[PDB]
Amino acid sequence: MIQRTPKIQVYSRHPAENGKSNFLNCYVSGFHPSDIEVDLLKNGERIEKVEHSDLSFSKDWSFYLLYYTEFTPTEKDEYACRVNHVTLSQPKIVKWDRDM
Amino acid sequence: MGPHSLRYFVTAVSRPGLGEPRFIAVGYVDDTQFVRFDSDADNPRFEPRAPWMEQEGPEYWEEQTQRAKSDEQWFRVSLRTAQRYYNQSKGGSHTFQRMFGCDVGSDWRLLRGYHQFAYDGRDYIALNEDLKTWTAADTAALITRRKWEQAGDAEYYRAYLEGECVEWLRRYLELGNETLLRTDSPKAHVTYHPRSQVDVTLRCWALGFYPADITLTWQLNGEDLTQDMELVETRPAGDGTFQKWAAVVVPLGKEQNYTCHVHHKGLPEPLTLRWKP
Amino acid sequence: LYLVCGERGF
């Protein structure tokens, strides 16, 4: 079994504007095997609406998935992506930074 | 114009104690997914993943479902066979992946036909570019190679890759032409981010573009900064377009001397951008 | 057009 740890980006579909509706994405890529737990978090708590793309992979065989939900950015609310995968000692949390 | 491709990405994963393997097939034209099959659906069918595929009639969907199901059974058997053969005596979940399809040139010649497999994330066997011989990675794959030579598989897949593969790519490009033959230029801009007393970060953004291929480069009055920059992988926006950014750390007060250059199919010439305070 | 490996090998 090869093991490749996922690369993770968390970002909005559109430029963030507070109080304006948008989409929050967590893109996970470069990982193997395909088994992976991804959750989107609002203030530390799991969002239940989340959808994701059909599992696919790249030329080097490594998988990628897009997880996404509707959301409304705000000054006070913290959004994040939580990822777990066999290559991690414990789940990894990547916070959404609207400038990245 | 330009190159185009039709690619299928197929994944089977065994699942100890859970019964049948998870089998997922996904088809892309260029950078746009258009179909899927997933064994975990409660009525597993080959199905459209782009609205323009709804123009294919029932016979296409039925035929493709039957082919997906037949492949599903074949991967299941292969997973059971491999597990015996590699002496994976602790059991566990294992993965077989298949990639196949065609890259065609702007003149519609077949640039490359693919029919290629990986086991547990490593190359297993692949049809070579000649569409006649195989590259095998280890002795298990030599055994499968012998069987596949015996059966004439290379000749069968060569006929499909040079014929049906290309013919169906054309058809899909026509059916989806509004979306597949578009080119969405990147909307670009520069943002500014404080870092320390002595420096800051300039980040160049390219948003809303299709196809995914793009180049972003920072320069300092002509001097290429490609190697000093932080560059994220191109990422899907979720609406069929892509995004990318590239950042550079520069001395506080010299922001105006740095320029971001953007290259994309949609840009007749490179876009040049600066921080606009 | 998906095409099946339908009763081949290892």
Q: What attributes does this structure have?
A:
heterotrimer, A: 100 residues, mainly beta, Immunoglobulin-like, 5-stranded antiparallel beta sheet, C: little secondary structure, 0% strand, elongated, peptide antigen binding (chain B), MHC class I protein binding (chain B), disulfide bond (chain B), H-2 class I histocompatibility antigen, K-D alpha chain (chain B), membrane (chain B)
Structure at a glance:
The complex is a heterotrimer of chains A (100), B (277) and C (10). With 277 residues, chain B is α+β, with helices and mostly antiparallel strands.
Give a structural overview.
The PDB classes it as immune system. Keywords: Immunoglobulin, H-2Kd, Type 1 Diabetes, Immune System. The assembly is trimeric. The entry is titled "Weak TCR binding to an unstable insulin epitope drives type 1 diabetes". Chain A: Beta-2-microglobulin. The complex is a heterotrimer of chains A (100), B (277) and C (10). Chain A has 100 residues and is mainly β. Chain A has a single domain (1-100), classed as Immunoglobulin-like. Chain A is 0% helix and 47% strand. Chain A has no helices and 9 strands. Chain A has strands spanning 7-12, 22-31, 37-42, 45-46, 51-52, 56-57, 63-71, 79-84, 92-95. In chain A, the strands form 2 sheets. In chain A, strands 1, 2, 5, 6 and 7 form a 5-stranded antiparallel β-sheet that branches. The radius of gyration of chain A is 14 Å and the shape is elongated. Chain A starts with 6 loop residues before the first strand and ends in a 5-residue tail after the last strand. Chain B has 5 helices and 17 strands. In chain B, strands 4-3-2-1-5-6-7-8 form an 8-stranded antiparallel β-sheet. In chain B, strands 9, 10, 13, 14 and 15 form a 5-stranded antiparallel β-sheet that branches. A 4-stranded antiparallel β-sheet of chain B has the order 12-11-16-17, with no helix packed on it. The radius of gyration of chain B is 23 Å and the shape is globular. Chain C is largely without helices or strands and 10 residues long. Chain C has no helices and no strands. Chains in contact: A-B, B-C. Chains A and B meet through strand 1, strand 2, strand 6 and strand 7 of A and strand 1, strand 2, strand 3, strand 5 and strand 14 of B.
